[PDB]
Amino acid sequence: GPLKPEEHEDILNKLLDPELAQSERTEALQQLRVNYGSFVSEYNDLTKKMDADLSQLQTEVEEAVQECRNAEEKAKKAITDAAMMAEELKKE
Amino acid sequence: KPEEHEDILNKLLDPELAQSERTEALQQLRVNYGSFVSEYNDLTKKMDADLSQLQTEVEEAVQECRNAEEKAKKAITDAAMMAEELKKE
Amino acid sequence: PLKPEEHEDILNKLLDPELAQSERTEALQQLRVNYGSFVSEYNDLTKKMDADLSQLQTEVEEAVQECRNAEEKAKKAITDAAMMAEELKKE
Amino acid sequence: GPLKPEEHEDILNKLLDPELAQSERTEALQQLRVNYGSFVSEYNDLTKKMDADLSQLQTEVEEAVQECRNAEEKAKKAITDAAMMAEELKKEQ
């Protein structure tokens, strides 16, 4: 997978030799180009996935929030009906 | 009747009381008592039904709190699920 | 409390003009005790129910407040999740 | 690692030169060495913040769960109180 630090350092070390064969130089540069493009791509795939994850969590917690509003509304109806029952008994 | 009920009982104490005036006094206690027992039974029936309805309506709010728990627990499990999903890659 | 049929027997007993004064006074005292106690039971029943309805309102209002506190904690997680997305945009 | 893929490509194209002076070849590889170490640390901190964010959100939502259970039990006791009131009204009869 992605080049580890020590494995990445070995490539940079052999690229330091000016008399390195061109076939080996292009091969090492290709490894850096493929590894850097794959690592950048993986970084953007996690940034996008986390942003969508945080957005999905906000929508799911909001449905629990709205359910708390239903609890307050129904409980307040029992309060209103209890006061209505009190006024109803004093009318008679 | 509040105070006139004692006036009717005081008038019926007279053994001289005319039978027409005695029957009218006893019938006044007859209609008033039947009206009072009905209002009492209507009261004990109304408050028993009122408290039963309040239990049902407050229970509706209890269930909404349960639904809120279930929605929020789903967000907790989903958040934990998208945590192990990030470590898989 | 005196039942409607049992109350009718006392009224029919008082209808008798030949009834002795000892039983007539005792039958009227039977109606005076029954009525004053019946009115007292009715008023005390109304007073107790009004205190019950007022107490239930207070107890449910406190349950509403806990629902509000639960709502504000859940909304805080939404607000914190939103700033977590903005703080990951520090690129 | 703020090096965009086009900036990284120019360094690779520079290292392709066989006649490249040793000082320029050493400097170019030093840029990649520092940039790669800064990009791995940024990747590790990202995976660290993502796990800590999802853990803190679970904790805050669980705090909201415990209060919903508390509000549930408060209202359930009001139901029992309402039932105990109806039982006490019937006892006095």
**Domain ranges within chain B, ordered by starting residue:** 4-87
Q: How far apart are CA A80 and CA A17, in angstroms?
A: 86
Token output for C26: 């005792």
Q: Are C11 and D51 in contact (CB under 8 A)?
A: no
Q: Are C76 and D60 in contact (CB under 8 A)?
A: yes
Q: Are A57 and B78 in contact (CB under 8 A)?
A: yes
Q: How far apart are CA D52 and CA A92, in angstroms?
A: 63
- Cα B81 to Cα A20, B27, C88: the distances in Å are 49, 81, 20
The C-alpha R_g of chain D, in whole angstroms, comes to 33
Q: Which residue has the tokens 């990202």?
A: D46
Token output for B14: 């007279």
- List subunits contacting chain C, requiring 3 or more Cβ pairs under 8 Å: A, B, D
Q: Which of C45, C55, C71 to mutate to test the interface with A (most CBs of A within 10 A)?
A: C71
Q: Are D36 and D11 in contact (CB under 8 A)?
A: no
Q: How far apart are CA A42 and CA B22, in angstroms?
A: 106
Q: Are B43 and C46 in contact (CB under 8 A)?
A: yes
- Among the listed residues B27, A26, B83, C81, the one whose alpha carbon sits nearest the alpha carbon of residue D61: C81
In terms of residues, how long is chain D?
93
- Put simply, whether C51 touches D (Cβ < 8 Å) is no
Q: How far apart are CA D24 and CA D30, in angstroms?
A: 10
Inter-chain CB proximity C77 and D70 less than 8 Å: no
Structure method: X-ray
Q: Which residue has the tokens 């977590």?
A: C84
- Among the listed residues B63, D2, B38, the one whose alpha carbon sits nearest the alpha carbon of residue C3: B38
DSSP state of C2: -
Where would I find the H helices in chain D? Answer: 5-15, 22-91
Inter-chain CB proximity A76 and C82 less than 8 Å: no
What is the sign, positive or negative, of the torsion defined by CA atoms of B80, B82, B86, B87? positive
- Please tell me whether residue A51 adopts helix, strand or coil conformation: helix
Where would I find the H helices in chain C? Answer: 4-15, 21-87
Task: Please state, as a whole number, how many other Cβ atoms lie within 10 Å of the Cβ of residue A73.
Answer: 14
In terms of residues, how long is chain A?
92
Task: Please state, as a whole number, how many other Cβ atoms lie within 10 Å of the Cβ of residue A87.
Answer: 9
3-state secondary structure chain B: CCCHHHHHHHHHCCCCCCHHHHHHHHHHHHHHHHHHHHHHHHHHHHHHHHHHHHHHHHHHHHHHHHHHHHHHHHHHHHHHHHHHHHHCC
Q: How far apart are CA B8 and CA D49, in angstroms?
A: 89
The C-alpha R_g of chain C, in whole angstroms, comes to 33
CATH 3.90.650.10 at B4-87, yes or no: no
CB pairs under 8 A between B and C: 63
CA B47 from centroid of its chain's CA atoms: 2
Token output for C44: 């005390």
Cβ neighbors of A56 (< 8 A, separation 6 or more) are B78, B82
CATH topology of domain D5-91: 1.20.5
Crossing angle (nearest 10°) for helices D22-91 and A5-14: 170
- Among the listed residues D59, A15, D72, A54, the one whose alpha carbon sits nearest the alpha carbon of residue B64: D72
Q: How far apart are CA D39 and CA A3, in angstroms?
A: 12
User: What is the number of H-type helices and E-type strands within chain A?
Assistant: 2, 0
- Cα A20 to Cα A7, D12, D60: the distances in Å are 18, 15, 58
Q: Are C9 and C27 in contact (CB under 8 A)?
A: no
Token output for C67: 């629902």
